Design an enzyme around this catalytic site. Sequence first.
Site, PDB file in Angstrom:
ATOM      1  N   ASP B 211       0.788  -1.190  -0.071  1.00  0.00           N
ATOM      2  CA  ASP B 211      -0.143   0.038  -0.021  1.00  0.00           C
ATOM      3  C   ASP B 211       0.737   1.241  -0.118  1.00  0.00           C
ATOM      4  OD1 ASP B 211      -2.388  -1.889  -0.150  1.00  0.00           O
ATOM      5  OD2 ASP B 211      -2.596  -1.693   2.067  1.00  0.00           O
ATOM      6  N   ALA B 231      11.923  -6.559   2.622  1.00  0.00           N
ATOM      7  CA  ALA B 231      11.315  -7.632   1.905  1.00  0.00           C
ATOM      8  C   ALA B 231      10.210  -6.965   1.245  1.00  0.00           C
ATOM      9  CB  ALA B 231      11.255  -8.839   2.621  1.00  0.00           C
ATOM     10  N   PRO B 232      10.248  -6.606  -0.196  1.00  0.00           N
ATOM     11  CA  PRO B 232       9.353  -5.864  -0.842  1.00  0.00           C
ATOM     12  C   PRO B 232       7.937  -6.854  -0.933  1.00  0.00           C
ATOM     13  CG  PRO B 232      10.899  -6.692  -2.259  1.00  0.00           C
ATOM     14  CD  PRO B 232      11.586  -6.738  -0.902  1.00  0.00           C
ATOM     15  N   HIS B 233       6.982  -6.500  -0.577  1.00  0.00           N
ATOM     16  CA  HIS B 233       5.716  -7.160  -1.235  1.00  0.00           C
ATOM     17  C   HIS B 233       5.450  -7.432  -2.587  1.00  0.00           C
ATOM     18  CE1 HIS B 233       1.676  -8.366   0.056  1.00  0.00           C
ATOM     19  NE2 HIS B 233       1.380  -8.354  -1.014  1.00  0.00           N
ATOM     20  N   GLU B 253       9.380 -16.553   3.176  1.00  0.00           N
ATOM     21  CA  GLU B 253       9.364 -17.681   4.313  1.00  0.00           C
ATOM     22  C   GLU B 253      10.441 -18.762   3.693  1.00  0.00           C
ATOM     23  OE1 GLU B 253       6.652 -16.687   2.904  1.00  0.00           O
ATOM     24  OE2 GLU B 253       4.647 -16.865   4.088  1.00  0.00           O
TER      25      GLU B 253
END
Lengths: 326, 326
Positions: B211, B231-233, B253
Amino acid sequence: EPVNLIFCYTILQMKVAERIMAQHPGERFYVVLMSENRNEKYDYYFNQIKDKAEWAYFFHLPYGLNKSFNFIPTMAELKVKAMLLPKVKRIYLASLEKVSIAAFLSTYPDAEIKTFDDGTINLIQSSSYLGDEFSVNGTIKRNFARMMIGDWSIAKTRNASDEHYTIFKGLKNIMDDGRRKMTYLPLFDASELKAGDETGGTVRILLGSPDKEMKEISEKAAKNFNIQYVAPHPRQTYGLSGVTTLNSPYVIEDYILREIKKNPHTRYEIYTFFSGAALTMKDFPNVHVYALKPASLPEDYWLKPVYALFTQSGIPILTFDDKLVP
Amino acid sequence: EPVNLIFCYTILQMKVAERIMAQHPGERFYVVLMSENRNEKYDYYFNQIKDKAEWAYFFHLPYGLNKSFNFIPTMAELKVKAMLLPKVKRIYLASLEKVSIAAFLSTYPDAEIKTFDDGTINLIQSSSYLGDEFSVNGTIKRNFARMMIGDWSIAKTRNASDEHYTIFKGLKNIMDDGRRKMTYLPLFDASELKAGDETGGTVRILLGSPDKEMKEISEKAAKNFNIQYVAPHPRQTYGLSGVTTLNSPYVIEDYILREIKKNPHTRYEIYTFFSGAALTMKDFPNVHVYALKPASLPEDYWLKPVYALFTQSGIPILTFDDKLVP
Ligand SMILES: CC(C)(C)CC(C)(C)c1ccc(OCCOCCOCCOCCOCCOCCOCCOCCOCCO)cc1
Ligand SMILES: CC(C)(C)CC(C)(C)c1ccc(OCCOCCOCCOCCOCCOCCOCCOCCOCCO)cc1
């Protein structure tokens, strides 16, 4: 050996698919990934799936198709989805798409729904699926009939729709069940063709079969009836030696209407192995359709209702003794 | 102004769409063509549709998806379709895909059906949709709750499925309704990480928000808590000045599991704006997750069940006074 299907729409779900596959090392899997998204992460896991499954397919989806979320959405995310949503007052679709896209329809419960013909399949009445050619369990024809009966019942009863448009004048429709307004929608305009008396040449066109085993029969028909031209079927992958192939961006119906206006004195003859396009063109001016029934094919190559529809439509059915042609 | 939708899967149907559109010159149409096929004829009519509709979309479909025919099929055509058909003994899919692909499922009535989690959405129990934040009619949250209630009811009751795989240990599942076997499926393997005592450095990683209005809050969080990495979405389109972006083909993960095995003495700290990935990683060795709740955002930016799930999971929720950071 039967297969297992896996349907995934996120990366973590593809990881779950991999775990399931690895616990069933002896079984066959076809895996489908559906996503609105594209990136390196999606590719990495999809390639792993490709490596591990018998068959894998990425099925791209239009952005915004899914109104739900696999994750718990924030207020911002709920807002974005809520206002991307087009407000929908009415949905028009083919009668059998009421079965195939029923889940999408259900997400617009207040939309007015109207249907139009799928095609000539609309011309086979409910009762026809109840005789004798569809009667022996286990057969391909029985399974077809059962599927169609089930589909038309869904189309006619779920997601109520209040009007159905048919392009076929004077042939009864499967959708004409008294639960909707039937409306005839003439697809083609024939006034303004300004067609006159047939004092010109005759142009003969064979409608090509999409079925490759019909190649020799087609060539034979062209020789036998002196047909100069073939209009290839959209899904036809071969040619007819000794026949000129028509090449056009139009469907045959529009192509002929354009030719009639250009050549208002020409007799057009259309020969067909019971193509459904015949049923739309029988009423064109200066157009004469002939169905060809090759003697070498079994009587049951065509479903029985086909012969009857062609006769109700005033289309001659010509026995073609294809084995008498070299 | 509301829109009308038209769904077509043949050329003649697109001609029907054009006729319908022309009778409603004052209305807005979005038209979707769905086809397994590609050719010049399909393009010509689709381009006409493109010209005439407010919005038009070609939605390619995999060959053989449709078991029905818009035309009356010959015996040859029935035979081809009948033996292209894979024989299907079992279908695995996400629990909410029981809603979205229900029409396809219904074409395999004798297949065994098993589901797996869609994602963290499975963690919101039925009762949560009944309070007080979802309670005011007309609101975006009410409409969401109504949609989810309806969807889970369909998933739980139609096309009976006899097992559901969850990746979440110790959190109750919406699908655990006594009508199926619940099976825990550990997605990630932590034995063989061989993680030891945290005698090495500390590595801090922020999970990026998809967002864009969170950009300044994210940068502030990184400065405030001394977080070196983001850690980019997957669906994130911006960067965080003064923070190193991790670049990897793995989901976070798997990336962390790879790092733990490589660095079995490193303390890993994961900071997140309530990302669902936190719920999978809380049990990793040498991993410490912190949820950040920025003071400047409304209490209802996150749905209430989110706060509770994080606390049930033993994940600290840290008030972050982002306006105290320059
Ligand atoms: C860009 C746009 C979408 C706004 C344009 C718009 C509205 C004109 C449009 C374009 C094209 C359209 O195609 C119609 C159907 O296509 C078949 C796609 O199979 C769907 C597979 O889902 C897998 C992901 O499941 C996630 C879980 O969901 C659960 C909730 O589902 C509720 C049911 O809704 C799903 C839609 O159903 C699809 C077929 O009917 C429909 C609408
Ligand atoms: C190549 C293959 C198909 C053999 C591979 C296989 C079997 C693994 C596979 C791959 C991908 C799959 O995607 C699942 C669903 O995708 C959404 C597509 O929206 C369909 C739009 O139809 C428009 C054309 O309507 C013609 C009329 O029909 C009427 C009869 O419909 C019966 C219902 O069946 C339709 C399938 O329903 C689709 C969504 O559930 C499903 C299966």
